[PDB]
Design an enzyme around this catalytic site. Structure first.
Site, PDB file in Angstrom:
ATOM      1  N   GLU A 158       0.891  -1.163   0.000  1.00  0.00           N
ATOM      2  CA  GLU A 158       0.000   0.000   0.000  1.00  0.00           C
ATOM      3  C   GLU A 158       0.931   1.215   0.000  1.00  0.00           C
ATOM      4  OE1 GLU A 158      -2.433   0.620   3.441  1.00  0.00           O
ATOM      5  OE2 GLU A 158      -2.995   2.631   2.721  1.00  0.00           O
ATOM      6  N   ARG A 211       5.791 -12.817   9.444  1.00  0.00           N
ATOM      7  CA  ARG A 211       6.532 -11.612   9.113  1.00  0.00           C
ATOM      8  C   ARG A 211       7.833 -11.511   9.888  1.00  0.00           C
ATOM      9  NH1 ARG A 211       3.176  -6.831   9.148  1.00  0.00           N
ATOM     10  NH2 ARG A 211       5.137  -5.644   9.482  1.00  0.00           N
ATOM     11  N   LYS A 225       5.121   0.632   9.744  1.00  0.00           N
ATOM     12  CA  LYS A 225       5.022   1.909   9.052  1.00  0.00           C
ATOM     13  C   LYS A 225       4.522   3.028   9.953  1.00  0.00           C
ATOM     14  CE  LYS A 225       4.949   0.730   4.225  1.00  0.00           C
ATOM     15  NZ  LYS A 225       3.564   0.268   3.867  1.00  0.00           N
TER      16      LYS A 225
END
Ligand SMILES: Nc1ncnc2c1ncn2C1O[C@H](COP(=O)(O)O)[C@@H](O)[C@H]1O
Ligand SMILES: N[C@@H](CCC(=O)O)C(=O)O
EC number: 6.1.1.18
Length: 529
Positions: free
Chosen positions: A27, A253, A263
């Site tokens: 994104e 992850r 982020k």
RNA sequence: GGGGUAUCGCCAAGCGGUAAGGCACCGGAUUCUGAUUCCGGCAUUCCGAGGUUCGAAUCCUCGUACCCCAGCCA
């Protein structure tokens, strides 16, 4: 191999697929980080190994959180890492008209409706982890009404939050994602790709599976938090008129010790000005690591070494450092630089100086040699001179000799201090012909350099698990020194690393280095035990 | 409630035949970088307790621990 590649092999064998087509879908709401490089290697790597294709898709479904600055940097880092995407760069927004058509299929089919429960009410009707949810009083409108109401929405007829399109599934599902998930929400926000053509935007769960199907993705790879979401991913496709059905597989992850990898957190360090920017050398972003002096090859090796599984993990910094040290140990040409200088005069030396030959790589004659200036007024690092101390100390002692790197043997005899007792100059004699060991720099032909010693950003191994993570930042993450380097470094370039003998690997730029004052970044130090 | 994971300090192979490898760590050998390179060492045991089997980390049972889900975020 890993669980995902084993699944791929089974699919090939059976004949369920004869090609593999993956995708990297970030994104555009921030810069890429080492965690994303795990995803890039996985997706682009599988495509290449299996003679397939891998797309680069920007999942741009939330205008208010994205910027065009992000799309540009993401494409930049993917390329820098060494990978190529299939065809043009894709955007979820390219499917905005398709997504809208499909939602209309759901409405006509009775599987979606326009709800007017406020953003507060929807949560209150949703149920809890152990208590089922309840149906909205607007859940049973007619196809005709929903169609009209959705159009009012599309046409900007409703204020934000005043209405939304929801799927009609099961409000008492143990899967909360299946409790009538929202499909579209109102937002009068200009989109970086579609400007102000749309005031309604699609939710991630509705968009992703449809974008995957239209692109022909065979294996949709994502992280572990989307496991519950796979159910909705499958519901949407099973309920619309689309010919393919991509299958999702989730892996764990990456978590790196002594750093945050979210982020929202990285954006906070940037926004609150606690680091120079996303590409600050202490940042775990691809750009920061690049600016720090990491080689794309070493990052690919890291991802290779760490593996891909479903086990939550937290890699130690030693693992990453090992990767860059391997590359640079082999390829970096050596040089001389003194980070903390003290003057040493060979009162025994006569002349304006001379020139000595130095190898560009001690263990690889093939890389060649160079000529460096020597003289009787040089610079050495303070930690290299001891008036006293143990038998293990192998450096310069106030009554002993040492070998100057690629030059002569010297012997300390006298010293000189100042007001605060600090030393100012070490007087030595040299053996007219002799050619521990220490590095040095000739004061006359020395280049004035700024050295930036970097360290771990946070004081704790797991800063993300702190109440206020910013308060556990390391005040010594950056320590700037003023030293002297051999004149050869005058022609250094941003993009080339060197091994400062007995110190570590350093590289130019740091966004600062002028022609007058060069700035060098310490990528990583040498193994010191 | 539902969805997941548990093998060496950190990662990670193993898919019934009797514990790979990497980072880290401990010795020793070279070395004009206390780096590099180089030999050697490092889980009789795989979250626990039962069960099946000639034989299981690999199958069954019941436990325990940790991660994710109640955004009109992704
Ligand atoms: N720490 C991480 N480890 C692995 N993949 C990650 C990590 N963080 C983000 N990603 C991913 O990046 C892709 C999308 O990025 P994003 O939307 O910005 O989360 C996903 O398919 C994941 O692979
Ligand atoms: N946008 C998703 C993509 C993952 C997926 O659904 O495959 C993410 O941020 O991870």
């Amino acid at each position: 191999t890993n669980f995902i590649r084993q699944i791929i092999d089974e699919d090939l064998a059976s004949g369920k697929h004869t090609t593999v087509h993956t995708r990297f879908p970030p994104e555009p709401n921030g810069y890429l980080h080492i965690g994303h490089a795990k995803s890039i290697c996985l997706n682009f790597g599988i495509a290449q190994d299996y003679k397939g294709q891998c797309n680069l898709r920007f999942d741009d479904t939330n205008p208010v959180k994205e910027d065009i600055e992000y799309v540009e940097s993401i494409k930049n880092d993917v390329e820098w890492l060494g990978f190529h995407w299939s065809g043009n760069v894709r955007y979820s927004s390219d499917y905005f008209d398709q997504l809208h058509a499909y939602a209309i299929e759901l409405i006509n089919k009775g599987l979606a409706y326009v709800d007017e429960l406020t953003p507060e009410q929807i949560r209150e009707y949703r149920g809890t982890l152990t208590q089922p949810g309840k149906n909205s009083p607007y859940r049973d409108r007619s196809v005709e009404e929903n169609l009209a109401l959705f159009e009012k929405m599309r046409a900007g007829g409703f204020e934000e939050g005043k209405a939304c399109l929801r799927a009609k599934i099961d409000m008492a599902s143990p899967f909360i994602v299946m409790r009538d998930p929202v499909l579209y929400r109102i937002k009068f926000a200009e989109h970086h790709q579609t400007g102000n053509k749309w005031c309604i935007y699609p939710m991630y769960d509705f968009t992703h599976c449809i974008s995957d199907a239209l692109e022909g993705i065979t294996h949709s790879l994502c992280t572990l938090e989307f496991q519950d979401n796979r159910r909705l991913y499958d519901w949407v496709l099973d309920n619309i008129t689309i010919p393919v059905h991509p299958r999702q597989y989730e892996f764990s992850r990456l978590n790196l010790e002594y750093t945050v990898m979210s982020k929202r957190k990285l954006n906070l360090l940037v926004t609150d000005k606690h680091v120079e920017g996303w590409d600050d050398p202490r940042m775990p972003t691809i750009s920061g690591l690049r600016r720090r002096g990491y080689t794309a090859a070493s990052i690919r090796e890291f991802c290779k070494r760490i593996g891909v599984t479903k086990q939550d993990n937290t890699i130690e910094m030693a693992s990453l450092e090992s990767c860059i040290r391997e590359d640079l140990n082999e390829n970096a040409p050596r040089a001389m630089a003194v980070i903390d200088p003290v003057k040493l005069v060979i009162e025994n030396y006569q002349g304006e100086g001379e020139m000595v030959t130095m190898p560009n790589h001690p263990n690889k004659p093939e890389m060649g040699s160079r000529q460096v200036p020597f003289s009787g007024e040089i610079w050495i690092d303070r930690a290299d001179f001891r008036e006293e101390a143990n038998k293990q100390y192998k450096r310069l002692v106030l009554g002993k000799e040492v070998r100057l790197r690629n030059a002569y043997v010297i012997k300390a005899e006298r010293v000189e201090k100042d007001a605060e007792g600090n030393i100012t100059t070490i007087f030595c004699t040299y053996d007219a012909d002799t050619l521990g060991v220490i590095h040095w720099v000739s004061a006359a032909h020395a280049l004035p350099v700024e050295i930036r010693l970097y360290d771990r950003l946070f004081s704790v191994p797991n800063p993300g698990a702190a109440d206020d993570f910013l308060s556990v930042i390391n005040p010594e993450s950056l320590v700037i020194k003023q030293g002297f380097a051999e004149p050869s470094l005058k022609d250094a370039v941003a993009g080339k690393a060197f091994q400062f003998e007995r110190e570590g690997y350093f590289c130019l730029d740091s966004r600062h280095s002028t022609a007058e004052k060069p700035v060098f970044n310490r990528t990583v130090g040498l193994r010191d035990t």
